[PDB]
């Protein structure tokens, strides 16, 4: 069955800067600006659209050693981008994919506003509990952050 999640986070990135870089160039930003939380991505297959299947492997003594992700949708006119957890890490013989959704919106003071869904398909009914959705916030808080000071520290990257 599906559990859903969802969350919402501020940045003081304007959305469709943040979407490029944060969304658009994660594969290039991410092990740049955060090695201590993801120590590479793979592009396994695609050209970035629909399908796309990325390996992302985080640093020794982490919880889990990799997953690979595929991108559902990309929407570049409303910020909006859709991906699946579909190998590695959690996922196994009780959960089959975990179906993520994130919109970025404008803000008038120049910031961004993320909002995010993440729903979970378990195999058989046993729970997606707190610790796991917990450790995946975090992740995202950091990852986001990370991206947000490189952006600031870096003003002709992204524009
Ligand atoms: O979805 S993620 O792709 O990890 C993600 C991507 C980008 C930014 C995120 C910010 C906060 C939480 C996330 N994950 C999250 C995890 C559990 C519940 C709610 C949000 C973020």
């Known amino acids: ?22 969304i658009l160039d994660g594969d290039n930003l991410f092990p740049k600006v955060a090695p201590q939380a993801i120590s590479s991505v793979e592009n396994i297959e695609g050209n970035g659209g629909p399908g ?5 492997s985080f640093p020794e003594g982490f919880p889990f050693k990799y997953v ?5 949708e990309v929407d570049h006119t409303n910020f909006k981008y859709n991906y ?14 975990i179906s993520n959704e994130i919109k970025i919106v404008a803000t008038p003071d120049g910031g961004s506003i993320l909002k995010i869904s993440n729903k979970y398909h378990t195999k058989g009914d046993h729970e997606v509990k ?3 959705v917990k450790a995946s916030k975090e992740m995202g808080e950091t990852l986001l952050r990370a991206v947000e000071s490189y952006l600031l520290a870096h003003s002709d990257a992204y524009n």
């Open 130 to 132: 707190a610790e796991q």
């Open 52 to 56: 796309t299947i990325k390996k992302i």
């Open 1 to 22: 069955g599906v559990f859903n999640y969802e969350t919402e986070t501020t940045s003081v990135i304007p959305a469709a800067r943040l979407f490029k870089a944060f």
């Open 84 to 97: 699946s957890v579909i190998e590695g890490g959690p996922i196994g013989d009780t959960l089959e994919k």
């Open 68 to 72: 690979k992700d595929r991108v559902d």
